[PDB]
Amino acid sequence: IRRAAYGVVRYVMESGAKGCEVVVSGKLRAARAKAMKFADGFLIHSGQPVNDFIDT
Amino acid sequence: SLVVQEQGSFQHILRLLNTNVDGNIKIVYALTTIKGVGRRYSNLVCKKADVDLHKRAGELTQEELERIVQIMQNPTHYKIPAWFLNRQNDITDGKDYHTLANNVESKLRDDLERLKKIRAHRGIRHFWGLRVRGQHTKTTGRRRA
Amino acid sequence: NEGAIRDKTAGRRNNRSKDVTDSATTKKS
Amino acid sequence: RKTPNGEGSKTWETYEMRIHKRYIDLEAPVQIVKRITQITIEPGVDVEVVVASN
Amino acid sequence: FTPVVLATPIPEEVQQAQTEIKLFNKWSFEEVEVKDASLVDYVQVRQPIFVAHTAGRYANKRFRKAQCPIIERLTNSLMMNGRNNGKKLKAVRIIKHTLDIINVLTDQNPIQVVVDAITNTGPREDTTRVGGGGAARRQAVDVSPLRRVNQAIALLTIGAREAAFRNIKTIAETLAEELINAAKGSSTSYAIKKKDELERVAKSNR
Amino acid sequence: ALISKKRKLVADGVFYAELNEFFTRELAEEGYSGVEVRVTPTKTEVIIRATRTQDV
Amino acid sequence: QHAVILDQEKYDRILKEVPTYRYVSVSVLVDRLKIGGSLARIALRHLEKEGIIKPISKHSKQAIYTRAT
Amino acid sequence: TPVTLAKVIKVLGRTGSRGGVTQVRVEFLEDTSRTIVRNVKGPVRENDILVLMESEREARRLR
Amino acid sequence: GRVRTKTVKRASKALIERYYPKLTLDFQTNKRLCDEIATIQSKRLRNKIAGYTTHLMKRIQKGPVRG
Amino acid sequence: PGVSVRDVAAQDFINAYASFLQRQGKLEVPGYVDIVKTSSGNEMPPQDAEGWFYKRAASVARHIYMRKQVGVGKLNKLYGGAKSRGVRPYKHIDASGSINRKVLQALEKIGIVEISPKGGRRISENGQRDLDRIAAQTLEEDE
Amino acid sequence: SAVPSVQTFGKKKSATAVAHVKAGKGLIKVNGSPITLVEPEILRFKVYEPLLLVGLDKFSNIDIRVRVTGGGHVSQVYAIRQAIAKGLVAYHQKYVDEQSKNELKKAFTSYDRTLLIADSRRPEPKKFGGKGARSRFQKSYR
RNA sequence: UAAUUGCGAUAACGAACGAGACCUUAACCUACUAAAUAGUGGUGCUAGCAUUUGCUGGUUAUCCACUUCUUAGAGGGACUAUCGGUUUCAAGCCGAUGGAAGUUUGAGGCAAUAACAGGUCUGUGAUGCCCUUAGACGUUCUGGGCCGCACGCGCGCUACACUGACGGAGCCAGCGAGUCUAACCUUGGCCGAGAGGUCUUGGUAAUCUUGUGAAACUCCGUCGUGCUGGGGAUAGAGCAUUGUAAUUAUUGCUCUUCAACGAGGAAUUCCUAGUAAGCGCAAGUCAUCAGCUUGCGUUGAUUACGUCCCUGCCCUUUGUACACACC
Ligand SMILES: [Mg+2]
Ligand SMILES: [Mg+2]
Ligand SMILES: [Mg+2]
Ligand SMILES: [Mg+2]
Ligand SMILES: [Mg+2]
Ligand SMILES: [Mg+2]
Ligand SMILES: [Mg+2]
Ligand SMILES: [Mg+2]
Ligand SMILES: [Mg+2]
Ligand SMILES: [Mg+2]
Ligand SMILES: [Mg+2]
Ligand SMILES: [Mg+2]
Ligand SMILES: [Mg+2]
Ligand SMILES: [Mg+2]
Ligand SMILES: [Mg+2]
Ligand SMILES: [Mg+2]
Ligand SMILES: [Mg+2]
Ligand SMILES: [Mg+2]
Ligand SMILES: [Mg+2]
Ligand SMILES: [Mg+2]
Ligand SMILES: [Mg+2]
Ligand SMILES: [Mg+2]
Ligand SMILES: [Mg+2]
Ligand SMILES: [Mg+2]
Ligand SMILES: [Mg+2]
Ligand SMILES: [Mg+2]
Ligand SMILES: [Mg+2]
Ligand SMILES: [Mg+2]
């Protein structure tokens, strides 16, 4: 999942994006479920600028 | 002005329907002390007796009471429609009465005991002491006395 | 419905005579 | 309800759709209406046209 | 006063002194003095009003509450205890009815009678709560001039509502009764009794 | 036909998302992205966006 | 009780008393007299014809009466 | 009742554990020199008239 | 309360630096000034930048200011 | 110079009007008229054992004066209040259906109102007469 | 008829009140009824206020007819005294004088309640969890 | 400072996320553009009432006019402005003037990092493992049950009445919804005391239902403080409506029945201004049913302009043998 998500980042970053984020949550390896976050660049989470800019 | 006096023509606490009427209140709200007489069934009877509705019980006459008796136990006669009567289409009889006086619960015990022998579920509830119109007895009416 | 209304047993005054168990008030874990 | 199932403090959302209607009245024949209405068009908009009177 | 007339009747009982002096329901605000200058500036007779209604902005500010035509400060204290909540149309009638009885028994200006009845029933010094962790002890203070107006109006209005509860008398009657019994303190006033029930207990603890 | 404009615009958006979801099922491997709907008073225009527009 | 009729001791007790009050209303007549207050309503309307009780204000609920002048 | 009035000079603290009492020092309305600090219940501002009983008192802090 | 954030201050601080002679003690003119020499995405944001930079002005016309 | 009914106090207007219709005696008020509550949500029959029907119907014509054409349901809603549901909340319940209608059916026999264009009921020329007439009669009753 | 005119309005809560101000013999009538027949009637002097402040005389050369929409019994009454008082500013704004105008705005403000100034207050919305805007539901705990 | 919000102090310097900005709504515009699905002036065809004329109603296409109210695109407007007082005469707060607007303008939307074995497998053809899979735990059909009542508790509705009830009379909103291979919102007419029935109809909707003629409230009158005509539980009897089907009363109507409740112990909840509370209406569910909810407006206050005492959260100091972190 790391070498999967990591590649998705650099792609999007090499795609001319101001920033990217990947959230992988689940059963990843074994037994207990845990979340893994992958983000690079710059991105804003807050106001209406979320509507017009971030695409999720 | 209603301010008239008279003298000794006034009598309070008279009996009606083998029950005893209040001395002074507006006659519609007076006769209602008899079970089987509501705030209206007295209002419509008093009108048909040509009695002043804004007179008081101790007033009127001795005979005006005896006419109020007639309209009460003969309600279908005096233009009072059937739907103003509690007894409409009385079971087996089919006739529209108005059960009055101390005769009210005697007729009530009658239909009660009637469907007690029918042994319908609605009646069994009465025998058990429960609610009949009912709905949820779960949280309600507890410490019923 | 015969034994139902013939039942002495089941009633209101019947249940109203004996009193409530201790289980009405109990909870947690 | 915000919440699927029943749990939590009771939290709702107000979802809004907004319809804006506006109309124009013109006098113009077959060589105008048929030509001007077909070419001027937008997705996300719904045009309509009226027979005379009724 | 050159009583002119125009395309509408503007009847005469109305058409009179409105341009001379500003009357109450019908009463004046001249010849009414505040009993003692403490609660002056905190009791407002000095900008007259016709009938007691306003668009209240009064609650926006701390002391803007003092700028109200106290009759209206009194009126609002009437609409409460449940079923009266929000109703000022039954309130102004309850005040106007009250004043007519006030100007029956004691004459004067019923608004100067309220001014008298208020200034009397505002407690001068008060008792407070101080600690010790359950051991109740009271260090006497002196309650603010503004609070005297607020506290008097309550006790007067609450005293009349209470005595008028299961009694046949009107709210207006008990309002005037309490107000006149407070014109000079008659000790029958509910607001008078509870007033000494503060001031007396004050000095006893200090 | 001829229903309220309140009801008409509702019925389109559902009909949009019904297809938008449907196209996201069959076309997933094909690199699907999003869809558009343009109603001309001739036919109806359903325009697809996709990464591999060849296999589509 | 409160004597909801008129006894002619009433009427005579009434008329030689009532104008003394400089405030009379629905409640007053049940207080200083023994009357029933529905008669106080019919009294004030009968006592209205002569200025024995002269009006001040009137409402379905309250109305004010001061001494005859 | 001897009483007296007092004009307000300045606001200082709000004492009491719940913070329901304000502190002020007051010119006597008679002697515009003399000033004694007092505690009050309701809200107070500069230039308003307090009716004191004990003309000395002055006890400062409360809990 | 009425405290102005840093984007405002850090702008108004840098406006007076390079624009001082062309800036005034009138807000409403400096408002119109802000739309010319500067670019501000929303109207309301501009008024605050003008409103502080005139407040920053009236102190710099009252004396030397530190920042 | 001149009067209308809009220059007249609403309640005291009907009084002079209603009793004048009770003086006139020609209405044909319905045969029941003592057994009805006027509203599904009114607990007791109207208190007036004399004509409330002249009282009511006069107000009907009064209201009819202002607006254009008003029907039975508009009137049964116009005459209405809250109905006590007992131990439940209050919902507003419209008046009796056979009253306001049968009122209007006895309001044409006086020539006061005529069945109207666009449906409903509108005042005629004669009703306008008696309306504006008793108006001044109660306007100049200041004596 | 032959008249020029000016028309203004006033608002209290959801009530809007429109007054037509033109020449005439001085008829003041709201909803086709005399100003004396507004029947909250305990508020009668509230709608009479805009007249008596400036004087009863100056309504002779001017005419006003009024109609009210929206609100409730009390909210409309506050709007008409705003409809009349702001109808008087205009007849003296255009048809006579500014010095004879400022002697209203200065005379109206000294008594101002509603009158020539608008009411800034509106209702505010309900949030979930309570029957009111601010108020919440009662809560249990244990 | 509402804010790690700023000012200052400064081995720190300069920026990013979150806050703020931003966005939605409610407030202002006699300035921009308009309008028969908005109104308003005017012109004609017509009544009443008084006649110098006036004043109030009626008539969409009878003709022409205006955009103030109404609608929404464009913008403008506030920035805490001006002034005063305090404080590093700093960020700031405080005061009055003006201002539609001066508690971030009121109310919201969205909302970092990280946490919980919180809830959800009974929203899902989202799901892993196990279970059952043909006399099934699939599915369907008939009936019952989920509502069953000695009782314990939580959200509530109705009340104890005279600042009321009742009976009449006065006629005032706003957010809304409404019928295709169809039966939705129902003005108007008639029949029925009522609930209703029927004949009509306008509208796919700023047109028509709808000015939703709503409720509280206002006014006149009736009752007279008496568990009273407050109160409406319970129960009887009859009439309608939904619906294959209403018995274990679906809902409504009418008559009679007329209970406890006379202001609620120790405890405890919600709330600072068009807010509390009172009051209804619309929509959600809905064939039928609201004592529920989401919103709406109506009537309109008491009291604060505070503190850290009770109850919690927040930082910093501090201590640890804890780190699966005081389960
Ligand atoms: Mg934000
Ligand atoms: Mg009855
Ligand atoms: Mg009742
Ligand atoms: Mg009514
Ligand atoms: Mg009820
Ligand atoms: Mg920083
Ligand atoms: Mg940020
Ligand atoms: Mg704008
Ligand atoms: Mg300054
Ligand atoms: Mg979030
Ligand atoms: Mg989140
Ligand atoms: Mg768990
Ligand atoms: Mg097998
Ligand atoms: Mg259940
Ligand atoms: Mg529990
Ligand atoms: Mg709860
Ligand atoms: Mg009383
Ligand atoms: Mg009533
Ligand atoms: Mg509306
Ligand atoms: Mg009783
Ligand atoms: Mg519903
Ligand atoms: Mg059900
Ligand atoms: Mg629910
Ligand atoms: Mg605070
Ligand atoms: Mg605070
Ligand atoms: Mg603490
Ligand atoms: Mg608590
Ligand atoms: Mg150690």
JSON list of N, CA, C and O in Angstrom, two decimals, chain I residues 8 27 33 41 47 51-52 54-55 62:
[
{"chain": "I", "resi": 8, "resn": "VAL", "atom": "N", "xyz": [-4.22, 40.91, 6.96]},
{"chain": "I", "resi": 8, "resn": "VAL", "atom": "CA", "xyz": [-4.51, 42.35, 6.96]},
{"chain": "I", "resi": 8, "resn": "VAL", "atom": "C", "xyz": [-3.27, 43.14, 7.37]},
{"chain": "I", "resi": 8, "resn": "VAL", "atom": "O", "xyz": [-2.72, 43.93, 6.59]},
{"chain": "I", "resi": 27, "resn": "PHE", "atom": "N", "xyz": [-10.08, 57.04, 4.89]},
{"chain": "I", "resi": 27, "resn": "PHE", "atom": "CA", "xyz": [-10.29, 55.63, 4.56]},
{"chain": "I", "resi": 27, "resn": "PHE", "atom": "C", "xyz": [-10.90, 55.49, 3.18]},
{"chain": "I", "resi": 27, "resn": "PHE", "atom": "O", "xyz": [-10.36, 54.77, 2.32]},
{"chain": "I", "resi": 33, "resn": "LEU", "atom": "N", "xyz": [-8.10, 53.57, -3.34]},
{"chain": "I", "resi": 33, "resn": "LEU", "atom": "CA", "xyz": [-6.69, 53.37, -3.63]},
{"chain": "I", "resi": 33, "resn": "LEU", "atom": "C", "xyz": [-6.35, 51.88, -3.63]},
{"chain": "I", "resi": 33, "resn": "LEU", "atom": "O", "xyz": [-5.56, 51.42, -4.47]},
{"chain": "I", "resi": 41, "resn": "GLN", "atom": "N", "xyz": [-9.00, 39.58, -3.37]},
{"chain": "I", "resi": 41, "resn": "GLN", "atom": "CA", "xyz": [-9.97, 38.72, -4.03]},
{"chain": "I", "resi": 41, "resn": "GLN", "atom": "C", "xyz": [-11.41, 39.09, -3.68]},
{"chain": "I", "resi": 41, "resn": "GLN", "atom": "O", "xyz": [-12.30, 38.95, -4.53]},
{"chain": "I", "resi": 47, "resn": "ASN", "atom": "N", "xyz": [-11.61, 46.25, 2.59]},
{"chain": "I", "resi": 47, "resn": "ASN", "atom": "CA", "xyz": [-11.97, 47.31, 3.52]},
{"chain": "I", "resi": 47, "resn": "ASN", "atom": "C", "xyz": [-11.16, 47.22, 4.81]},
{"chain": "I", "resi": 47, "resn": "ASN", "atom": "O", "xyz": [-10.74, 48.25, 5.37]},
{"chain": "I", "resi": 51, "resn": "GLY", "atom": "N", "xyz": [-8.82, 49.85, 6.19]},
{"chain": "I", "resi": 51, "resn": "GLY", "atom": "CA", "xyz": [-9.16, 50.39, 7.50]},
{"chain": "I", "resi": 51, "resn": "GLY", "atom": "C", "xyz": [-8.02, 50.37, 8.49]},
{"chain": "I", "resi": 51, "resn": "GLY", "atom": "O", "xyz": [-7.92, 51.25, 9.35]},
{"chain": "I", "resi": 52, "resn": "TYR", "atom": "N", "xyz": [-7.15, 49.36, 8.41]},
{"chain": "I", "resi": 52, "resn": "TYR", "atom": "CA", "xyz": [-5.98, 49.36, 9.28]},
{"chain": "I", "resi": 52, "resn": "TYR", "atom": "C", "xyz": [-4.88, 50.26, 8.73]},
{"chain": "I", "resi": 52, "resn": "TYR", "atom": "O", "xyz": [-4.23, 50.98, 9.50]},
{"chain": "I", "resi": 54, "resn": "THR", "atom": "N", "xyz": [-5.09, 52.96, 7.10]},
{"chain": "I", "resi": 54, "resn": "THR", "atom": "CA", "xyz": [-5.35, 54.35, 7.48]},
{"chain": "I", "resi": 54, "resn": "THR", "atom": "C", "xyz": [-5.16, 54.55, 8.98]},
{"chain": "I", "resi": 54, "resn": "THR", "atom": "O", "xyz": [-4.65, 55.60, 9.41]},
{"chain": "I", "resi": 55, "resn": "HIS", "atom": "N", "xyz": [-5.58, 53.58, 9.79]},
{"chain": "I", "resi": 55, "resn": "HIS", "atom": "CA", "xyz": [-5.24, 53.61, 11.21]},
{"chain": "I", "resi": 55, "resn": "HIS", "atom": "C", "xyz": [-3.73, 53.55, 11.41]},
{"chain": "I", "resi": 55, "resn": "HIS", "atom": "O", "xyz": [-3.18, 54.23, 12.28]},
{"chain": "I", "resi": 62, "resn": "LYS", "atom": "N", "xyz": [0.90, 60.87, 13.27]},
{"chain": "I", "resi": 62, "resn": "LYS", "atom": "CA", "xyz": [1.05, 61.31, 14.65]},
{"chain": "I", "resi": 62, "resn": "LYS", "atom": "C", "xyz": [2.43, 61.00, 15.24]},
{"chain": "I", "resi": 62, "resn": "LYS", "atom": "O", "xyz": [2.74, 61.49, 16.33]}
]
